[PDB]
Amino acid sequence: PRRRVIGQRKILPDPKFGSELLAKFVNILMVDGKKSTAESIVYSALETLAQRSGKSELEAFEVALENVRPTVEVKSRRVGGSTYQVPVEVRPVRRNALAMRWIVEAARKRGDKSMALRLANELSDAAENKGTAVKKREDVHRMAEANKAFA
Amino acid sequence: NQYYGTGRRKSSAARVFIKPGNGKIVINQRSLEQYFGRETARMVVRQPLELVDMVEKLDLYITVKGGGISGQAGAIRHGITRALMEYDESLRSELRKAGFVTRDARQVERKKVGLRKARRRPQFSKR
Amino acid sequence: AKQSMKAREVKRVALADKYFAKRAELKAIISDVNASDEDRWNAVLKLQTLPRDSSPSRQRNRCRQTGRPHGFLRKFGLSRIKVREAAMRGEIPGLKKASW
Amino acid sequence: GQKVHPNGIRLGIVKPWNSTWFANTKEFADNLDSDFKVRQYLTKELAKASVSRIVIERPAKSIRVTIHTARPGIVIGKKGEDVEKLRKVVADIAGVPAQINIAEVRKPELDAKLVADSITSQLERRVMFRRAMKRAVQNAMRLGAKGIKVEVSGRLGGAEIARTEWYREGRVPLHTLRADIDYNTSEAHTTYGVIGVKVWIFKGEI
Amino acid sequence: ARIAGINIPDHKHAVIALTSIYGVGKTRSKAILAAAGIAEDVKISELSEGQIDTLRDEVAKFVVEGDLRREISMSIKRLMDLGCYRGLRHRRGLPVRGQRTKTNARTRKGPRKP
Amino acid sequence: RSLKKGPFIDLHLLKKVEKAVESGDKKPLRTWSRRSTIFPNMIGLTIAVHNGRQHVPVFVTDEMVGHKLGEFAPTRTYRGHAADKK
Amino acid sequence: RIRIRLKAFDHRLIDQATAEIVETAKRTGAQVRGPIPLPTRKERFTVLISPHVNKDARDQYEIRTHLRLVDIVEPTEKTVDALMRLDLAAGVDVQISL
RNA sequence: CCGGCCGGGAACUCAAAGGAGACUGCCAGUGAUAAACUGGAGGAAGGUGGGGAUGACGUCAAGUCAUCAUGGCCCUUACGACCAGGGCUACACACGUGCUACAAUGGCGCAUACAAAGAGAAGCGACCUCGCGAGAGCAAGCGGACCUCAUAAAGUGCGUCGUAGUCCGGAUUGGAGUCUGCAACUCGACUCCAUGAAGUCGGAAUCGCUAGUAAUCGUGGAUCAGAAUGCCACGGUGAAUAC
RNA sequence: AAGAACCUUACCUGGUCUUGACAUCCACGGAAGUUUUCAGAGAUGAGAAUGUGCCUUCGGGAACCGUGAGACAGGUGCUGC
Ligand SMILES: [Mg+2]
Ligand SMILES: [Mg+2]
Ligand SMILES: [Mg+2]
Ligand SMILES: [Mg+2]
User: Fold this and answer.
1) Does the nearest atom of strand H lie within 7 Å of B63's Cβ?
2) Non-local CB neighbours of F72 within 8 Å, separated by 6+ positions
3) Cα F69 from Cα F17, distance rounded (Å)
4) PANTHER family in the record, alphabetically (chain E)?
């Protein structure tokens, strides 16, 4: 976009509950334009981690992804010939979306028997701060912090 | 003693009859839950009526053709929302505030020449 | 496009429809499952006795203007380019520049 | 070498087809090539007679052929014996039974075919192309044709390299589909090779 | 298990078991196991020795493994010696069925040494 | 693999081979037909099949019957190839 | 009872055709069952625009054949006499069926 | 006989003709008070609603003399013409554009939904019978909103396989067939049985896409006797991001 | 190239023709058409039966075929500078 700012889109709520961020999470899951299978993966994973976390269902998910949810993100501007990275404050709308993207990638990289089982256990350990998802956030965080001077 | 609306979305056209009396809903002589009701977008079809009172007050005998699952689902949706003809002006504001009255035209784009899917082209190489 | 060979083609259509389509039963009836008599084999032998050009399959179905093999359209009979040419100048009824 | 044929794009609206008849899958091809052969026969035979355009139609296995021409006297001939003979020939080609109508174009110096074949005659008689096409344009503007573009391409007087000239007067709105614009093109076979000439005339806005 | 030339894998269902012997695929193994009455979902470990004793003769009814490998070798040898076109190609290491030798068909041609 | 009913031979070749058998083997045959099929009676004959440039003599053995004439007259010449080592 | 099924290319032309046949049956002692639009068939063609390469450039063509059904119910003798020879309107193909 | 099957009906899908409707029209703010911009309401649709056709003067001595037309120039008992066979399909290699994968958001088995558009008389070819199948026999209907191609597939339910070069993959070859066609050797497609290669997500590099788009799922047509993983076209599911 | 088994086909090998396969003109005859034999890869070549049909100038016609003479025909041959 050279200039024009666009209104974003109202995404249809998940069928079981009323959370829009969860339906968004579904969208970041699905490959192959298949909403129903990946959405089944969302559910199956969520409820199979639910009782084990001890929180009931969704609030376990927010308290989960909140830990992988970045605060400051680093981009590249004003290259000096060496192309240095500048840290900038990430939008509130991009922080949870970026989170969800990171967790989904985290699930895919290591592998396990099934994605629902895989997603759930990695997220459960993301709520603990074991996961490679949260680790991904911290390395991003270190890189931002090591280069704070530039602003 | 009967009220009507149409609705349609993406190649699938809906026809919807609402009446007073019981609250049961049926699509093509078959129950909603066993027509498409076991697949996701469970909510979309009953949500316009959930925006106001649902109770046992209104029966829906509806039938549709064409399109797939979700195309039909939305078709029905737009069906009810323009089938609430009784009290339509009084429920009109609620509907538009929450949408549903817009048809959402938005149908498939034609495959063009030289490009395979309507917008995608055959990976241009530079030499 | 070499009126030699499109003359060849008018020849082969002449011959071709002068023999088969009528005496083609030499295969069409005999060669099907039915009596399995040796006479049938004799029949296929009579099918190679004939001129090769007799079979219709040999038609390349050229343009009725330039005799151009490729790009032919059997709804019109003209190659794609004279379809376009006559099309725009208005010689073919009903054809319109299409946008749907 | 890009612009679409201005009749073709426009044909849906203000330009009826040069052939008006119906056919099915079977006979479409055969009456269409018969159509070709009748047209080439007439326009070749009448080349001198100045025929503007030929519109043919085929009601109920009979063919009705309307000839639009500038000089009707010569195609009708004395006491209309020649139209009879032509009618015999096109009965032969088109299949029986032929009919013919002679329609006269009231102002031949407008329509594209006649101005085109004129300046292709001047041009084949080695007049200077320049005032051939000047003569054409000023001719069409005298009658008050609301616009014209005459263009000439080719060798142009034995010049070894090809070149293109054109003269546009008044409005010639090619992109207005509604606009009534007549168009044609005619080749001249000259001692130096073919030289083609196109003419657009713009007769009115609606 | 130990029927025909070899067949000794483990953790497998019945047709998936029998596909290990050269010369029996999925469908004809399914023919065997529908022929001798053995259920499909049963791993060979827990089936009784009686119906495997039937399994041995049942698979014996079909020509398998030993004689196959030989008859194949002697068919590729019959062409190879005969001088048939497909023989000539078997011989030269190219494809026979008429595939493109321009670019692809290096599965028989082998990965390039140069 | 082809011709469900009726092995295929062109009649001129079956007659030439018929009167070739009844008259005893003498000389190769000049046939151009790659299209025909070997038959039991044709064995022992040295009949030359057309490879497109000339006729190659092939000595028919009973081990080859179900096959056809063509594939025993290879058309395209290959050679060692360019390769002819550096 | 009897149905003349008429088809053309331009509908502009077909209108007054079916119109003057329906009313030429009206003044011949009516009882006509009326014109029906049915679907129109789209023949569709893509031809390559140039005499030599650039396949990517193609050109679209339609042939839209429009049809109508009239299906008159009671064939009074004068009606069936008036629907023959007065079929007129060159360019349309009208098909008598009983 | 519970199928709009038959009476019946013209209400609604649907069809296709003719019209209505959206143009800054209205409200408010900004703006030279102007043009216009921003936001609101009404509205199915809002500022070019979405898509297509439509490509200015000219450039590249761009492409095409092999569609065609054409000036020169050349061959004329041959550079012309007919025929059979071969060849355009070769293969140590390199590139481009695609299809199929490398798996579990999956494979395999049974059951079960929901499309649009298109073709068809030397044609589409149902029902029934035979064959494991490709198909064969018989034969109805249809120049077609009626008949046929025609069971949409992904999806959904249940059952299993359990990270393995595997029940992934299906290349290669052998055997046995079928359909077209005078004729499947060089050189067709399809089927059945057997065989089950490379491949564990890809270096330097590089490409397409701003929404019914990408991705993925099937369906149709042209050409065409036969010969699509190409081309043109239709619908299903259906995103992420634009600071 | 919207579809190379033969055809397509423009290329190669070999067998063949020279007003020529394709068009008009002239002279000299035959109806066209149909079936059939042999030789040959087929082109073709040598045959044998059958048919003899629509104006009436009847010396002539219409169409198709056949032989000769040339005027020509033919070329997907070169040049898109
Ligand atoms: Mg392309
Ligand atoms: Mg020519
Ligand atoms: Mg063909
Ligand atoms: Mg263009």
Assistant:
1) no
2) E83, E84, E85, F49, F58, F64
3) 13
4) 30S RIBOSOMAL PROTEIN S13/40S RIBOSOMAL PROTEIN S18, SMALL RIBOSOMAL SUBUNIT PROTEIN US13M
Ligand nearest to the CA of B115: 1
Please check whether strand H approaches the CB of D172 to within 7 Å: no
Q: Which amino acid is at E88?
A: L
- The CA distance from E27 to E43, in Å, is 17
- Cα A134 to Cα D126: distance, rounded to the nearest angstrom: 88
What is the D33 CA–ligand 2 centroid distance (Å)?
19
Beta bridge partners of C62: none
Three-state secondary structure call for residue G95: strand
Method used to solve the structure: cryo-EM
Tell me the domains of chain D and their CATH numbers: 16-106 (3.30.300.20), 107-206 (3.30.1140.32)
C-alpha pair distances (Å), A111 with each of A45, A48, A116, F43: 14, 17, 11, 66
| Residue C95 in domain | no
Domain range holding G24? 1-98
Helix pair A115-128, A58-65: axis angle to 10 deg: 60
Query: Protein F76 CA to nucleic acid I44 C1', in Å?
Result: 30
Point out the ligand nearest to the CA of residue C67.
2
How many Å from the CA of A101 to C1' of H241?
12
Q: HSE-up of B19 (CA within 13 Å, CB side)?
A: 9
Amino acid at D158: G
**Dihedral sign from CA coordinates of B18, B20, B21, B23:** positive
Q: Which residues on neighbouring strands pair with residue A95, listed in sequence order?
A: none
Residue A12 is given by DSSP the state: P
| E strands in chain C | 95-97
**Looking at residue G19, which CATH number applies to its domain?**
3.30.70.600
Residue A85: enclosing H or E segment and its boundaries?
strand A85-89
b/e per residue A104-122 (b: at least 16 CB within 10 A): bebbeeeeeeebbbbbbbb
Q: E33 near E89, Cβ under 8 Å?
A: no
F25: CA distance to ligand 1 center in Å? 60
Give me the number of domains chain C comprises. 1
**What CA–CA distance (Å, rounded) separates A14 from A10?**
12
Report if residue C78 sits inside a domain.
Answer: yes
Give the nearest chain B residue to G48 (CA atoms). B113
Block residue for tokens 């008044």 = D170
